[PDB]
Design a protein around this nucleic acid. Structure first.
Ligand SMILES: [Cl-]
Ligand code: NA
Ligand code: NA
Length: 326
DNA sequence: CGGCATACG
DNA sequence: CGTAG
DNA sequence: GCCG
């Protein structure tokens, strides 16, 4: 009854198993910090199955036959149903390793490998890192300076204000170019950190060279606190009552021929896209990315004019963005 | 056992 | 190495 | 960690 791939079932943003899914996601996150990518995927997939169920799990019986539930994930759920806590999860939460890796990887410019090296060197706090700007890259310096602002999510109303400023710059850079809101806000989030815009033009080829022109114009407006092409990872100045705050904004350009693929990828969720690409390759023999869908035996790319086309090509029922919260 | 998504900066 | 979804 |  429950399909095995997340892209085969609707997953709404809010659901009926929030506590269970959150606990499994702690174990997934911890597995990533230890470089255990297989275990991370399993725990993420198990959590996602619970998000897709139509009602709360109340008895261990209800996990039978659900994909991605084996001995370990079932034990986690059993303990939460019986006692309201899972000792393994609680041990992770209160561990110095988990807490410090989470803190450091939250910094823009710091991934698991850098965080782990710093951990092994004995560093534990943001002020530890600030006392040794020796080691830091320019990107990490910006991430550290803006960390407090970047830790607090922005509202959809903030996103709409940001979109108007981006549209103004994009219109000067290339009249007729369009701006689409992607990421979690397109999936229905009311607040988030993942402010993402996808830019195209209806005349194939006109978008070439566009992103530098957009970035130059946003910088001249004083809006860019940090930037380093077709993807730009920025920190922007967002107005607030009497002041402003830093916000992470990603700008992406695609030709219109690729726009449906880029829209699909950049709308997420992350797990949804990994599962969609896995399904494509393993079940349909087609290779999917954010630029296109390739048939390696005919050696041809699918044309798509819509996300609906892409789901049809893959033999999947269409899911609107709001149902891609795997 | 092998596999686990697939890109760009 | 980092970043994205 | 789980699936095929
Ligand atoms: Cl693993
Ligand atoms: Na990071
Ligand atoms: Na983003």
């Amino acid at each position: 009854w429950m399909p095995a791939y997340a892209c085969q079932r609707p997953t709404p943003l809010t659901h009926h198993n929030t506590g269970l899914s959150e606990a499994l996601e702690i174990l997934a996150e911890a597995a990533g910090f230890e470089g255990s990518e297989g275990r991370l995927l399993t725990f993420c997939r198990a959590a996602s199955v619970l998000k897709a169920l139509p009602s709360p799990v109340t008895t261990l019986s209800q996990l039978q036959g659900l994909p991605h539930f084996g001995e370990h994930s079932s034990r986690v759920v059993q303990e939460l149903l019986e006692h309201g806590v899972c000792e393994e999860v609680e041990r992770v939460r209160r561990s110095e390793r988990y807490q410090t890796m989470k803190l450091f990887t939250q910094i823009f410019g710091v991934g698991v490998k850098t965080a782990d090296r710093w951990y092994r060197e004995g560093l534990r706090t943001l002020d530890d890192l600030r006392e040794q700007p020796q080691k830091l890259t320019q990107q990490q310096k910006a991430g550290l300076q803006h960390h407090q602002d970047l830790s607090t999510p922005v509202l959809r109303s903030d996103v709409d204000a940001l979109q108007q400023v981006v549209e103004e710059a994009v219109g000067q850079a290339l009249p007729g170019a369009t701006v689409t809101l992607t990421g979690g806000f397109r999936r229905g989030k009311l607040q988030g950190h993942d402010v993402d815009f996808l830019i195209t033009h209806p005349k194939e080829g006109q978008e070439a060279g566009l992103l530098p022109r957009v970035m130059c114009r946003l910088q001249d407006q004083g809006l860019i606190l940090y930037h380093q092409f077709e993807r730009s990872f920025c920190i922007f100045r967002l107005p607030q009552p009497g002041s402003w705050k830093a916000v992470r904004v990603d700008l992406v350009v695609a030709p219109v021929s690729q726009f449906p693929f880029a829209l699909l990828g950049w709308t997420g969720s992350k797990l949804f896209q990994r599962e969609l690409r896995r399904f494509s390759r393993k079940e349909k023999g087609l290779w999917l990315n954010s630029h296109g869908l390739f048939d390696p035996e005919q050696k041809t790319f699918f044309q798509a004019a819509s996300e609906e086309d892409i789901f049809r090509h893959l033999g999947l029922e269409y899911l609107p963005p709001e149902q891609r919260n795997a």
